[PDB]
Design a protein around this ligand. Sequence first.
Ligand SMILES: CC(C)CCC[C@@H](C)[C@H]1CC[C@H]2[C@@H]3CC=C4C[C@@H](O)CC[C@]4(C)[C@H]3CC[C@]12C
Ligand SMILES: Cc1cc(C(F)(F)F)nc(Nc2ccccc2-c2nnn[nH]2)n1
Lengths: 339, 284, 220, 55
Amino acid sequence: SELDQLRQEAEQLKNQIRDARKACADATLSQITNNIDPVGRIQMRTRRTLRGHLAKIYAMHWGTDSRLLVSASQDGKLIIWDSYTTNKVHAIPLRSSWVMTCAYAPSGNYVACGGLDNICSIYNLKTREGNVRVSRELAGHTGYLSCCRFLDDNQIVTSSGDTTCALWDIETGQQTTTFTGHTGDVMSLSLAPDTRLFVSGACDASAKLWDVREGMCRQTFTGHESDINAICFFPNGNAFATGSDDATCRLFDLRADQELMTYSHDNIICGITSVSFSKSGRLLLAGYDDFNCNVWDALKADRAGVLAGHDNRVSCLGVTDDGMAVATGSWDSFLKIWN
Amino acid sequence: MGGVIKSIFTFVLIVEFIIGNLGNSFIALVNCIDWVKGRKISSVDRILTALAISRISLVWLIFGSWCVSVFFPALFATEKMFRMLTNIWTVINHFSVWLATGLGTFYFLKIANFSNSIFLYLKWRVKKVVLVLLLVTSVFLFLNIALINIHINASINGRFSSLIVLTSTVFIFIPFTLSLAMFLLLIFSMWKHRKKMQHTVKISGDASTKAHRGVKSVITFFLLYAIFSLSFFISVWTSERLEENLIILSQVMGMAYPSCHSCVLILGNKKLRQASLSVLLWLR
Amino acid sequence: LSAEDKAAVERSKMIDRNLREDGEKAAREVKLLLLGAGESGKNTIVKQMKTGIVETHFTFKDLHFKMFDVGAQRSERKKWIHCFEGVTAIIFCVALSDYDLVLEEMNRMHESMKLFDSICNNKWFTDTSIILFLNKKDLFEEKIKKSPLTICYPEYAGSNTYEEAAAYIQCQFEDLNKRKDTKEIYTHFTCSTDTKNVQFVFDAVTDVIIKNNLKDCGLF
Amino acid sequence: SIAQARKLVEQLKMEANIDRIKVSKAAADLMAYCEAHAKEDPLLTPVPASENPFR
Ligand SMILES: CC(C)CCC[C@@H](C)[C@H]1CC[C@H]2[C@@H]3CC=C4C[C@@H](O)CC[C@]4(C)[C@H]3CC[C@]12C
Ligand SMILES: Cc1cc(C(F)(F)F)nc(Nc2ccccc2-c2nnn[nH]2)n1
């Protein structure tokens, strides 16, 4: 009775928000940008290939100086690379070799990693001794950590597979906010440029816009038909892109609260592992498990190039802060920098 | 009698030149296509393409020697061409047969399971061991070149092929015996492991992927050893006893290993068998 | 290159040397993924052989074993089972004392069969062998006298002794191997008062290591 | 089940009261950002090799 009434109320609210998002759908992004100049063909080439990892790469993150990048691999190693000279600054041995994410702090003083041990381990790079030691081991999650992102030197936001995102205080070691609105495993994170709100793509074919200070979900985006593995904001902070296992990428607008464009091809029948935008937002770079990466025109939904050159599944990719280079990591234990 | 025998041996040499060139060219060409079309290359594949290149060189040397001898006997009678051919053959043949024994050492160290400490020390340093085996065995090459040149000098001071062939055949026996010993030890290791896995563990609930696929390679390898040790004994006895038709028969026997062993190596590598099946598919 | 650039190059060379040495050490280690049901019983196996996932290290006859227990991972296993694609073997522990028990929509043995069919026929474990333990044979012997095996498998039609029932259970797990050409299933019958299981794992992993060496040599 | 349903109802009610804009304005804003920042995009317009850090 009461459960049926609440289900009817939920269906009524779902139909109301569907009708409200239908009423603000006067035009389409494909129709509006049908008279803009298309970019011809993005021919990127491999400049530096980073060797040294002996197992599959699961995560990379760039630095804010656009030169230092950290990589995570199943060999229990966290290598910090100098991308200009192709040489290793640090090689951090992890206590658990089952790493699934890595993060680089904006100040550059810390790196993070986590995975099947359900622990976000934070490493101090700038110590008086010459080594990189463990600063903290944040342990409150029930499932595997999927993504971690630094807010500053004292805060980190972690996504886990126990249907929960958490925001931590590193000095205390405790979690200040728990984000609990999902249904499946949360697989991806993306922080906004102003660092006040973030999106999380999960395994319920949904992406949720969270507020860091308030701790409540603001928007829910339901367009995909499979597990979302990758998420990334637009540089503007007013839109984001999702990469799922149904071989489609989608662009969602925060203010319009719905989907603007689908980046799909009939020749692609395999999922998306990583997504990243360009500095201008014109190019959407999506890493697939057809062994290569596809460059999409974000305003016209047309492929502009293919970053072929990886012998296994491209699991992680990221564009630098200045937009000069794109580094792709894959399961063949190589990192390649494209420009 | 001699003319029809020489014609039969000439037909044999043409057939084995064709087979050897096709097989070793197929090995090198398959590895080259797999290299240029962005695919991984194992260490066994590198050793196999090294054997293929060396055997192409050796079979071209012996076929060019036969072409020079048939077309230009006056050029063939000179001591300069004879000494040059002899020394170039012994260098290329030494490198080829010791690379084959290096591939055998690679197989034996990778596959066989023994409890000896020295065996394990060699077992975890296979690349270093095969490189050391190639570099150390150059003393055999230097001593072989020395003894052949002493025999040539004695022959031209007194062409003494009855001792040149014997010295070369002795110098091929040492890597052959090493390879046979490594093969027998590998078979003994596999038999000991099978006897252990037949009485403690109830074999398999599947019994599909095991040495049941490798017995084909073992059988086609032991057949080649048997039919080549027989030809060893036959050639040594016939060269020692009474023969005066030595040049064509010895030119035939020198091409037997680099022509037939590559065909044996094709039947026994999964990549080469898959490439052969794809060739036979797209030909039809 | 400057002086500091040359010294950075030397530091990278030392880091590369240490990475190569660590990789050569780790390639000689045996990695095992331990799987089972909740009531199947894996703590007695780890006790005999010695949140998050649990790594157990033990050395037996100059082999370093790494055993990984993912039973505490209560998440969707399709999102992390590819992390164990490179593994020497999978140890699947099945109690055969719970054919008569229930979890009611499936039996315990049927749940174990479904998990075995999912793991064995996974796309990441085509060439990964499975070591099968049949635990609690004493309770199975003391329970087959009263309760017949017709409760679990209704199409049995065989003698209700210990040996025939155990053979039928082993055959029913080994008939779910749809590959049956590039992987092998090793079956052992264990009990609590028995210390021989590490020997069985050693024998099976030596067989798997021989097959992997033959595959790396190109002979398969 | 009652508490989860009440939380879902409250979240769906909080998600409805959002000031929405049209798709046309969102597309125009994204197009304006991409046109404004097009010059400072090395992947779109490739920089010369003198100013390329990866040469
Ligand atoms: C292992 C045994 C059975 C076979 C070994 C093959 C050896 C003995 C054969 C193969 C090719 C042969 C050479 C081919 C051509 C010539 C030129 C001629 O002036 C005779 C000597 C000489 C230089 C031969 C000497 C013997 C030789 C080196
Ligand atoms: C084609 C094939 C198959 C097999 C196998 F059945 F054992 F897998 N073994 C070999 N060879 C050797 C094995 C041991 C020592 C030496 C050799 C050797 N001799 N010459 N070349 N390799 N070869």
